[PDB]
Symmetry: C6
Subunit: 304 residues, 6 copies
């Protein structure tokens, strides 16, 4: 909805956003939203995501598709009215994204999703990219395990010429919706095939906000390697504007750079990561700050 | 409608436009249009804005969507007829923009929306953009609060990978419409995802006139950063021709330039702004002229 | 229709076209077509202009839209047949342009619309453009008042982020149609938003011929400023091929060049204009010639 | 239809084609086809041309549109079957072009349309183009009068911002069909607006063959002037491949070059023309050979 | 259908393909397929070719169009099923190409179509192209007569601004279909207008296999001359990949190079041709080897 | 479906993927999936592949198309639900790819398909490409026979101007589906015509995963030769991202490089091949390693 502010309320909002990243217990936001989703009336639509055609499919709290739901409205705080209607398995009325309120007045946050190796990591979408020899696939799985901490991480596989890989976009959005509804740490291996249909465009522009709203993190690999300034600019834009965080390789093999948006209007943080391989390509991230916009663009150049 | 002029009536119009910016009490035009809107018959369509498809949704004076409204025509002064009809939630007949006359013979103005730090600011659309390290989001919020003065400013959030952000264009136009119908100072954070669907194109070409006619100001951030002459040129066209005023970053961190169109055929004014950050990135604009077209083009080069 | 000629009849036509610009009394053609229009049977469709979709809307001699008109044919001189039919507000049969014959055998003219400061001006479409500091809006209004002479000029406002400005193309073409049906001197401020839908394309290729046939002049501002060879070439083509006359700014501030097509197969004339500003930006054109195709292309280069 | 040949029959075909241009009486082919068209059963479809949408309209020998014609087939010599059906004013079955046989076994000719100043001119389409100061409009009218000889020439006007000019493509194809059905010499002033819709593409590719089949000549002006390699290549292709003859200006003012395709597989002829102006821009062509492909391309370069 | 191989059966296939070009009596494959076609049930669909829209029309063994044919399936050797159905003149079910098996296990051949001047020529499609002064039209006709030998060659005319030329794509595919069903040697003058609609794209990708399967040869002229890397690259792709053989002009007037694909996986052969003109441009090809891929690419450069 | 992992289960997965290529018996995965397929209920849809339009066709375990199959759902392990429904020959509900689970938890593998000349080859899609004189058709057939080993290889022929070659995309995908359902080693000659419709796009992004899941290998020829950075980049992307393995020619004639993806997150292997020709162009691959991402991109440059 829209929000109204004066100097006081705005300063309070910023303090609260700062806290959502810097001081809140890691993963607490996810726990809170899990509670909100579970308190929902059975059969109530909680998430709508766009399929390839641009239409949207809707899911309930248990990640089951809602095929028929008769028009139902809800008047919000600002007076606006929210409407949701599902017919023949497709949203007739409503919008893409969370269909129930998880944040409230607390918007524009990058809820700390986890802490690892002395660094806090944000929820939302993390795009892993860059050129060079450092491998991306091993990196997303290592990050997924690290941020997962005590919990297992969920893996969504898409568009690779390997066994068992789904290559259908509509099955892909279904897997992603189920993942965000049920797990805090999510790995997506290969955003490459989405990179374009309407559903693919909706996904790039929606996923970061969906995840951040949920308090979960979606770690997605994205290879720039494609000397086609049409697609490459799309890769840089997705990394610059649709990603909550960015993990990009450097000049040194095994070394990565993490750029994190800490919240609405807040500064971006940066830290380095060292890694090494064990058996069967299993990667390990070794354990034992503020960066300017000009610097951000410098890193974006790496993908050219 | 169309207007007829001779030397005398034209000179009077120009003096009137001049005054609407230079001498009228700040925000007085907004108060005037609030009165016109509130005098409208209940349930009467007052504003129509385009959704993604290119269709238009309609609202009444209370920012409530009109789903059904049988044909109804009104003959204007120039003999032209206006017909409005709404069926199944969409305009069957009518046009985009204000459906009731808010201006009358007083057209081509940039009604002063507020005065701050010794400068007069125009209503209509203000694009906040530029390259470099100066933060845009912090600036739009500080401008909102500064021009809001005694009033709270309205915040419309769109397309950012942060918690609680809507990324659905149709929810976006609904927010914008409600905001212009109810508040004098509006901040839109991220016009980035609009910059393209028919609805997006309608939005860019309509919002400036819509706001200027209401006497409200829409402060929208737009990032150029995207070395793609296709989009970058679209950013310059939007800053050049679709904005009533432009606020753009300088070579010096924290310093901004304000370029204001003061009226139809009138000269553009320019002044500088110094800013500084307080706690949690809350930005403060410190307190304590004419510019030719060539100069304007020089400033536009900055975005390359 | 088609016309047949031999050496004798062709020479007579050329002498008549020459006269229509060089010796006829200024504005007499407009008076003559006003008489043809008023002598039309009530309810008879006289003008059809394309809306955004490419469809056309029809008007009668009083600039009132005709929503229903059953099929009706008329056989011309060359034996051809003209058929007009309007259903549900849209032309079902017919063509865009004047639906009644305003010219007869007298075609290919640039009927003198007015005389000012010692120069004859042609009816039809005049594009006011160029780069540099000389302001276009002030010029089109000054030209409208100068060619208006004893009569008031009509102003069609379109696509500018100022108060009371319509930004809807279908309202715009209704405004234009009504203007040409009722006034000899018309000003269009901002052809920028048309410069693309089918209707926009129809407007650019139709308006010059419609106005010249009527004997009215349409003075339109068109800013080239937009380093995008796709649109800039479109601006040059509209100036070169869809304009009866061209008014373009020069190296010297306040100075303008007028390039006039005097008739079919005739030479283009050129003269200069000096201007100055008074109060509230009211511009005054000071008072007290054949140009080749190469010279013409030279002036077109100015817009790059 | 398809034709079968052996060395003898082929040598005879070539001799006959050579004759159609070099020795037949000028205009005799047109006279013969006029006879064939007049011998046609009343109401029989004789010509189909494509309107803007790509659909085709059909005309009878008197240039009147056939709105309803029930399916009717005719088996040709090679055994193929020709079908023509018209419903609601549009061709349901059939093809674009002449619907009755005018040539027979005599195909691939450039029937001499006229002789003037010691040169034979071909029927089909003649495109008049080039850069520089030599005027095209005066040239097409002078050529039309010259080739017309004892007969008047027909003028089809399209897309110029002058009085009486039709700017509707569908009215344009109607004018052209009527012209080819009734006159040997045809002038088309401004092919510029066709230069793109399906109907416009069909016209460029069909007109030359229609005219040559009829024995009439269509003299069309085409300005290249438009530094847009997309359109300019289209101008060069139309001049190179859809024109039976080409008349292009040279370095010397008033001087033109005529390049004529004399038939299927025959050599292209070339000759120069000197011209001068009299009163009111009436041009006169003064009175008192084989060119290679490489040379042809050299002239095509002139338009860049 | 699909075929299975082991070392033995593969070696036998290759010896068979080798012989189909090198040792079989010239034109014997055409005679063989004529027999297969004539043994087909009356009214049975044998060939389907795509019209402009992308739809396909169907013919029987006598080159007569089938407008109605109820579903009918046929199980092939590999267990695959072929279903053909024609409704309202268009294929409802089936595929483009030969609808009856003309080859069997003998696939991937370039059946020798004729022997002339000591050289063997392949069936399938032959593109005659190149830059320079050597005439293409005269050459395609002389090749047609030379390879026709004792038989007349068939001529399909398309898209030339000359008398009696069809310019309708759907009439074109009808001619081509009839020609391949009834004659061994076919000449298509001007593939220029195809080089783009779905039908045109289908034609370029289908004709070569269609002809090679029939044992007939299609000799088509294609002019590169069009400095537009978009189309020119399309000409090279057509000469490179869609043609069974290529005949291209040299630096020397009258001299041509023939590049022939002799079979699936077999080497390409090359030989030169000297020609001279007789009366009325009738060209005569005078009478009295392996080439690597790099050489081939060198020849393709000629078209730039 | 989605899979969850912790450090332990992830390491087990990687060890299993490693084994699936490095130590499993060659071809065992194919035998295992053949067993899963044959144990399926009769009439059960097992494979869906997209036709040209983007629609999908369905096949049962015997490679016979299913034209009608009423809605039927199956709930997986992650709680997801798979729904298949076929109506009028087309999938109404379901996804493209394998419709039955061939992999289970064992995903992300490149199942060893065969061992030859001391090297293990991966199933999935292998693209054979490169520039230069080394012939591709001879290579794909030699590779098919070598990996076939004791078994015959299946050949799918598509889009070549040779006898018996299908050129219809819908027949092509039916051929491919039948091949993967019945044979371990498949050769596709000429992927050129797919390199674009929705179905072509679906094929490139689906085939690798379909084949790898099955344990079969699809060896396809793809010629880069086409100096059009639009298609060339598409060729590089298909080689880089849609190929399980790549076989590309080098500087030395007859010599080839094999680049193999060994599994999800695993390293790419590389080895060289020497070949020579025998009679009738029958090629023989002579008998008697980790490569970095940078080295990979280097080989991709070869195709420019
Ligand atoms: N033991 C090891 N030592 C060094 N590199 C290893 C390794 N095991 C795996 N890798 C690297 O892991 C990398 C990633 O594997 P891939 O499947 O190619 C995913 P990616 O390359 O990260 O993204 P991509 O598929 O979009 O290009 C490869 O570069 C591989 O070389
Ligand atoms: N205390 C502080 N000192 C200096 N800069 C600060 C700051 N707090 C916030 N900023 C700056 O605020 C800027 C804007 O925050 P963002 O959320 O990135 C919006 P933006 O960058 O202005 O526009 P964008 O999101 O369209 O690119 C960032 O560049 C950040 O560095
Ligand atoms: N008193 C004055 N002295 C000098 N210039 C003046 C002036 N009053 C107005 N102008 C000029 O009037 C010019 C035109 O006003 P604008 O509203 O920008 C229409 P334009 O610039 O002609 O076309 P545009 O809006 O498409 O660019 C401005 O460049 C302004 O500087
Ligand atoms: N008396 C005269 N002396 C020299 N030139 C003359 C002339 N009378 C007319 N002309 C020339 O006639 C030419 C043609 O007039 P236009 O209406 O511009 C048609 P065009 O220029 O030939 O083709 P175009 O409209 O596509 O550019 C102009 O260049 C004009 O200068
Ligand atoms: N007697 C002769 N001597 C030399 N050349 C001759 C000739 N008779 C005809 N020609 C050449 O025959 C050539 C071909 O005639 P055209 O009808 O132009 C077909 P083309 O030029 O080969 O292909 P195109 O029409 O696609 O460009 C011309 O270049 C002409 O010069
Ligand atoms: N005996 C032999 N010695 C050398 N090369 C041979 C040969 N037999 C066949 N070849 C080569 O086999 C190569 C491939 O045959 P083609 O039918 O052209 C398929 P390709 O060239 O591999 O792919 P392409 O058709 O997409 O370009 C040719 O370059 C030919 O020279
Ligand atoms: Mg990867
Ligand atoms: Mg921002
Ligand atoms: Mg202006
Ligand atoms: Mg002209
Ligand atoms: Mg030719
Ligand atoms: Mg090959």
């Amino acid at each position: 909805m829209i929000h109204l502010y004066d100097a006081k309320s705005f300063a309070k909002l910023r303090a609260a956003q700062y806290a959502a990243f810097h001081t809140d217990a890691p993963g607490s936001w996810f726990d809170h939203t899990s509670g909100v989703l579970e308190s929902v009336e059975d059969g109530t639509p909680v998430l709508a995501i766009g399929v390839e055609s641009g239409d949207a499919i809707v899911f309930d709290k248990n990640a089951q598709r809602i095929v028929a739901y008769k028009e139902k409205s809800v008047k919000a705080e600002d007076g606006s009215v929210s409407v949701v209607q599902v017919e023949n398995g497709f949203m007739k009325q409503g919008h893409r994204g969370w269909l129930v309120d998880l944040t409230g007045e607390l918007v524009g946050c990058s809820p700390v999703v986890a802490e690892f190796g002395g660094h806090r990591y944000a929820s939302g979408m993390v795009i892993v990219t860059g050129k060079g020899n450092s491998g991306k696939t091993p990196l997303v799985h290592a990050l997924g395990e690290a941020l997962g901490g005590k919990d297992k991480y969920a893996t969504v596989r898409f568009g690779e010429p390997l066994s068992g890989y789904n290559t259908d976009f509509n099955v892909f959005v279904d897997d992603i919706a189920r993942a965000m509804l049920q797990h805090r740490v999510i790995v997506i291996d290969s955003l490459k095939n989405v990179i374009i249909s309407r559903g693919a465009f909706d996904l790039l522009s929606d996923i970061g906000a969906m995840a951040a709203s949920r308090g979960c993190v979606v770690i997605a690999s994205l290879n720039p390697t494609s000397n086609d300034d049409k697609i490459v600019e799309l890769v840089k834009e997705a990394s610059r504007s649709n990603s909550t965080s960015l993990v990009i390789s450097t000049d040194v093999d095994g070394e990565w750079q993490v750029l994190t948006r800490t919240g609405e209007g807040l500064q971006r943080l940066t830290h380095t990561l060292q890694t090494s391989y064990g058996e069967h390509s299993v990667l390990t991230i070794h354990t034992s700050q503020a960066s300017g916009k000009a610097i951000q663009t410098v890193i974006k150049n790496d993908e050219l």
